[PDB]
Amino acid sequence: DAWEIPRESIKLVKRLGAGQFGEVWMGYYNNSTKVAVKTLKPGTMSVQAFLEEANLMKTLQHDKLVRLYAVVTREEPIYIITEYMAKGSLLDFLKSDEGGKVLLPKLIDFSAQIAEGMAYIERKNYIHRDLRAANVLVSESLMCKIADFGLARVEGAKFPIKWTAPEAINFGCFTIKSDVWSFGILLYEIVTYGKIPYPGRTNADVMTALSQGYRMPRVENCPDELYDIMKMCWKEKAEERPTFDYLQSVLDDFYTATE
Numbered sequence: 719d720a721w722e723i724p725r726e727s728i729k730l731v732k733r734l735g736a737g738q739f740g741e742v743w744m745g746y747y748n749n750s751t752k753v754a755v756k757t758l759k760p761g762t763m764s765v766q767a768f769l770e771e772a773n774l775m776k777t778l779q780h781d782k783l784v785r786l787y788a789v790v791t792r793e794e795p796i797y798i799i800t801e802y803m804a805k806g807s808l809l810d811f812l813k814s815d816e817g818g819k820v821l822l823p824k825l826i827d828f829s830a831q832i833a834e835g836m837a838y839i840e841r842k843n844y845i846h847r848d849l850r851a852a853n854v855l856v857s858e859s860l861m862c863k864i865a866d867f868g869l870a871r872v873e874g875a876k877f878p879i880k881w882t883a884p885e886a887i888n889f890g891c892f893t894i895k896s897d898v899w900s901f902g903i904l905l906y907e908i909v910t911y912g913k914i915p916y917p918g919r920t921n922a923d924v925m926t927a928l929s930q931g932y933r934m935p936r937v938e939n940c941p942d943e944l945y946d947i948m949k950m951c952w953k954e955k956a957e958e959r960p961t962f963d964y965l966q967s968v969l970d971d972f973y974t975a976t977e
Contacts, residue, residue: 721776723747723788728755728797734806739763740795747799753787756798765796772798774867778842782835784855784865803863805856812851813912823977824860825908826944830969831862832904837962839864840894847875847892849900851907879921880914884928885956895956901965902951909940943972 732744740757747753758768768791775786790797808828811817832854839846846853847869855865869875876882876892883899886892903915916924916934926932933952936945947968953959960968 721772721786721789722792723790723799725790728753728790728799730755739768744802752802752804753799754802755790756800758796758798760794765791765794768796768798771866771868771870774844774870775800778839778844778867780835780838782831782838782863784863801863802858803855803865804858805860807852808854808856808862809851809907809912811856812908818911826969826973826976828862828908829901829905829944830966830973832864833901833962833966833969835862835864836897836901837966840897840962843872843894845869845871845892845894846897846900847871848878848881849897850878850881850904851912854904879924880916883956884954887925887928891956893956894961895959898951898959898962898965899956900951901962902948905944905948905951906934906937909937909944943975947972 727748729746729749730743731746734742734744734754736742736757739762740759743755743757745753745755756768758765764770769789772786772789775783776789779785784801784803787799787801790799805811832849836846836849846864846867848866849864853864853866855863857863869877871892876886878900879887881900881903882892883896886896906915907913916927919927931954933949936942936948947965950960950965
């Protein structure tokens with residue numbers, strides 16, 4: 719029970735967000751500590767799967783990954799107490815007021831952090847499976863941390879159609895290279911300031927496009943830099959695709975150029 723904590727020490731306040739397997743509250747830890755707690759409503763998931771993804775980070779831990787803390791599970795509901803990121807998902811943030819407020823300097827600074835923590839998991843020999851702006855929370859100080867790890871692996875984690883790679887979608891080949899592919903779609907997600915990959919289309923008519931070597935055109939503005947340091951990630955040939963460190967690294971060099 720190492721990672722064990724008694725109830726009554728958790729006081730739920732704000733509702734934050736929810737899904738098809740529970741919700742996320744803004745509670746307190748023995749008061750004095752802003753904390754988010756993952757719900758998990760019975761008959762929806764389980765109690766080992768919710769306590770399954772709780773072990774992943776229960777052993778991942780890095781400065782770029784919303785790290786655990788403690789769990790609360792000795793009688794429904796089941797809890798997963800982790801770091802709090804006032805700002806919320808990077809997707810919403812960039813769509814909010816101050817979101818579009820900032821510019822490249824900070825934007826370029828983001829893909830860098832995702833790329834960094836991403837380079838981490840690449841070492842730990844893992845895969846996120848759902849790496850998209852929605853899964854990245856922002857620190858109350860504008861720091862980038864990779865959240866969620868339900869689909870994380872070393873029976874299916876793919877859902878993010880408009881992010882998954884042709885291989886893992888075509889032949890079920892999810893690999894670090896799958897996430898690389900995803901970093902481009904994620905990059906595209908910030909320069910446009912939160913637009914959905916391949917607008918107008920339906921994740922249903924996306925399966926296709928690929929088959930036919932379809933890729934989105936450079937973004938209306940974004941410097942070739944990121945755009946080409948974007949085509950890197952989309953190299954159909956899983957191989958041709960860079961490794962994070964590289965991205966991570968190149969996202970630093972071609973960065974300062976900005977500031």
